[PDB]
Amino acid sequence: APTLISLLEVIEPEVLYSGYDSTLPDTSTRLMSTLNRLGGRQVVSAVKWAKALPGFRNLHLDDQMTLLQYSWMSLMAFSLGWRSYKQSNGNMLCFAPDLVINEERMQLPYMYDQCQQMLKISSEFVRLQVSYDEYLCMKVLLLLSTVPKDGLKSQAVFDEIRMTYIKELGKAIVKREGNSSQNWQRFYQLTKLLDSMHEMVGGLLQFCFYTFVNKSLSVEFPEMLAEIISNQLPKFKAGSVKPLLFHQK
C-alpha cells in the first residue's frame, strides 16, 4: 500500500501547452486573452485533480463547488510560482513551456504590474527552496483555504480533511530535512507562506475582476472562467468570503 503523498504525485496534472503563436507580435490584449484561455483549460484540469483528492468527494457537492470557485486563482498562481521556480529560478514566468515571459517581455505597460505580482509568488519558492512534496501538500491546503462566512454544509468532513493534509504537510517536511528537531520552524515558515497567499492573490483577483467587468479593454475569457468569476464577483464584493489564516496577523 503506497503513501498519500505518492498519490498526490501521480494525480498532479501535466503542464499544458498554450499554443501561443509568437509569429504575430505581443500586445497587452492578446497576452491576457491567451492567459485566460489557458487558465480555463488549467481550471478544468484542477477540477479533475480535486475529484481525485482522497476526502474531497466526501464533501457535499455544493461545498466542492464553493471551494473550487473560491480558491481557483491561488491554485493557479501557486502552480505558476512553482513552474517558474523550477524553469528559471523565478527570473521568468513559465505560464507554459511555449509561453515564457522574461524580464524584457514583461515590459508591456499594462502587463508589468501583474507580472511583478506573479513574480513574488515564485520568489517565495526560491527563498524557501520548497520541495516538490511540500508544494503538493500546500496546494491542497490552498484549495481548503477560502470559505464562506456562513460556513460549509459539511463543516466536519471539511475539518477532518484539513487535518489530514496538515499532517501530510508534516510528512513532506520530514522527507525533505530528516528528523531535525527544527522541523517546527519549517512548518511555521510554510504555514506563513500559505497565509501570505491571500494577500499575494488579492492583487491578481483585482486585475481579473477589473478586466472581466470593464470590457472596453477587450479581454477575452473562456466560458469556464466566466462562469466562476461572474459567480465569485458579487460574493467578494459583498465582503462575504473568509480567508483561513494559520496565524493571527
Binding site: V44, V47, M65, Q69, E227
Partner: peptide, 11 residues
C-alpha cells in the same frame, strides 16, 4: 453553474 456542475459529476 452548468459547467462546473457537469465536471463534478462526470466520469
Amino acid at each position: 453553474n452548468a459547467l462546473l456542475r457537469y465536471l463534478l459529476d462526470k466520469d
